[PDB]
């Protein structure tokens, strides 16, 4: 069953180990799923894998979703057997304490807990203070520097959140980590798969790219854009979903009310003709679409749209609750509609339409 194989892919992706800089396990999963569906596979030297579905040489459509997740890296082993760490990507410190993580050593996976000094051994005026991430560490159950070393831990070893994947709300809502942005990778992979399976023709060549190192500076996007030389780009990301009580204007999108379209973000102002194109394609296809704006965040598009002489680009999003944290939620219905939408766009992105954007 394909619905099984899809959900099995989703589960495997969200449960895979792949923080920024260490995405090889996740991109291997992507290659394997796509062996029977991509006409060719190209890579960048940072570790981004890109799947090509052939059609007309031009225009080249780049779809990108980053497979790196926010994570950590071992910065030292203390004499008592605790690990210090640096963050990989943007974390809010207040979601870290008490959380389970797993470190990948040469000897395998080692489990631990993010910890700090307990407040009752601090002065009364220091207990009301937020604990900064610089003062946290990871407890792996070791009782000495040696016992810690026996587990295989070395400075520079990568760390991810520990967070199992499941579905809740009677099959409607997915729960787990790394939705940002493996759900975007999931969408582009499923789009390409479906186009082949149902023989859907498209007047263009599609480059579906699982980029690396987005969360640390849009690094894989820059190098993948160089490799591809795209004529138009659809970046798939998550949107911060403002479903939480308290205003509306800072987070327009709601989980379950359809994919989002980003009208402005700190890294890019979208091409306006292309924006209007997506809005219309969605309206015509009756796919609900939420206009969104990310005042203080960026995307792979920030680099892609600046490739060579420029590249018209838009960001399309799945509203997700609690990103950049151990566990988030998103709607499977929104995801499905994002897949539908992207297919409809690709169907209609011929050379003439694309030249009309510039």
Applying CB under 8 A, among 125, 171, 248, 286 the residue interacting with a copy of itself is 248
The residues, any chain, with a CB within 8 Å of residue 111's CB and separated by 6 or more, are 100, 101, 102, 103, 140, 162
x/- mask, a copy of itself, residues 16-55, rule CB under 8 A, reads ----xxx--------------------xxxx---------
Q: Which residues, 6 or more positions from 56, have their beta carbon under 8 angstroms from its beta carbon?
A: 203, 204, 205, 350, 351
Which one of 23, 69, 157, 180 is in contact with Co ion (CB under 5 A)? Answer: 180
Q: Is 12 in the site for a copy of itself (CB under 8 A)?
A: no
Give the nearer residue to a copy of itself in terms of CB position, either 18 or 193. Answer: 18
Instruction: Choose among 6, 5, 25, 1: nearest CA to 15.
Output: 25
CB of 145 to a copy of itself, least distance (A): 11
Does residue number 115 form part of the binding site for a copy of itself (CB under 8 A)?
A: yes
Site for Co ion in 5-64 (CB under 5 A): none
Give the residue numbers annotated as catalytic, written as ranges.
Answer: 214
Contact 326, 264 (CB under 8 A): no
Residues 127-186 that bind a copy of itself (CB under 8 A): 128-131, 134, 137, 139-143, 147, 151, 154-156, 166, 168-169, 172-173, 175
Q: How far is the CB of 101 from a copy of itself (least distance, A)?
A: 11
Binding test (CB under 5 A) with Co ion, winner from 15, 157, 181, 265: 181
The interface partner of residue 3, options being Co ion, a copy of itself, none and the CB cut-off 5 to 8 Å by kind, is: none
| Per-residue x/- track, 69-98, Co ion (CB under 5 A) | ------------------------------
Binders of a copy of itself in range 262-321 (CB under 8 A): 263-264, 269-270, 272, 275, 291-293, 295-297, 305-306, 308-312, 321
Asked if residue 325 binds a copy of itself (CB under 8 A), the reply is yes
**What's the length of the chain?**
358
Half-sphere exposure at residue 6, Cβ-oriented, CA atoms within 13 angstroms:
17
Helix 24-34 with 179-197: angle, nearest 10 deg: 10
- Beta strand pairing call for 108-115 and 232-240: unpaired
Element (H or E) spanning 223, and its range?
Answer: helix 219-228
The C-alpha atoms of residue 221 and residue 301 are separated, in whole angstroms, by 8
Give CA torsion, residues 349, 351, 354, 356, to 10 deg: -130
- List of residues contacting Co ion (CB under 5 A): 180-181
């Amino acid at each position: 069953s394909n619905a099984d194989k899809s959900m099995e892919l989703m589960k495997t992706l969200m449960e895979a180990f792949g923080p920024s800089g260490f995405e090889r396990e996740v991109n291997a999963i992507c290659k394997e799923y796509m062996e029977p569906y991509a006409d060719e596979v190209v890579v960048d030297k940072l570790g981004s894998v890109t799947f090509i579905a052939k059609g007309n040489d031009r225009p080249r459509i780049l779809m990108a979703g980053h497979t790196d997740e926010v994570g950590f890296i071992v910065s030292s082993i203390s004499k008592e057997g605790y690990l210090t760490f640096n963050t990989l990507g943007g974390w809010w410190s207040q979601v870290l304490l008490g959380q389970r993580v797993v470190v990948r050593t040469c000897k395998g996976m080692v489990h631990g807990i993010i910890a700090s000094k307990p407040p009752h051994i601090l002065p009364p005026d220091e207990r009301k203070k937020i604990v900064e991430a610089r003062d946290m560490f990871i407890d792996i159950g070791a009782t000495s520097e040696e016992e810690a070393e026996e587990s295989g831990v070395k400075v520079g070893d990568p760390i991810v959140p520990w967070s199992p994947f499941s579905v809740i709300q009677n099959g409607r809502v997915a729960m787990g980590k790394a939705f940002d942005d493996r759900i975007g990778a999931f969408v582009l992979m499923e789009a390409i798969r479906r186009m082949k399976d149902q023989g859907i023709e498209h007047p263009n060549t599609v480059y579906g790219s699982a980029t690396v190192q987005e969360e640390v500076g849009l690094r894989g996007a820059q190098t993948t854009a160089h490799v591809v030389d795209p004529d138009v780009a659809l970046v798939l990301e998550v949107d911060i979903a403002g479903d939480v009580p308290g205003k509306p204007h800072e987070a327009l999108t709601k989980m379950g009310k359809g994919p989002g379209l980003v009208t402005y973000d700190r890294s890019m102002i979208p091409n306006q003709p292309l924006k209007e194109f997506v809005i219309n394609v969605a309206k015509q296809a009756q796919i609900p679409l939420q206009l969104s704006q990310m005042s203080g965040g960026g995307t792979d598009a920030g680099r892609i749209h600046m490739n060579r002489a420029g590249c018209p680009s838009v960001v399309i999003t799945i509203p997700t609750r609690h990103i950049h944290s151990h566990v988030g939620l998103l709607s499977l219905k929104d995801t499905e509609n994002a897949i539908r939408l992207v297919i409809e766009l690709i169907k209609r992105l011929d050379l003439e339409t694309v030249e009309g954007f510039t």
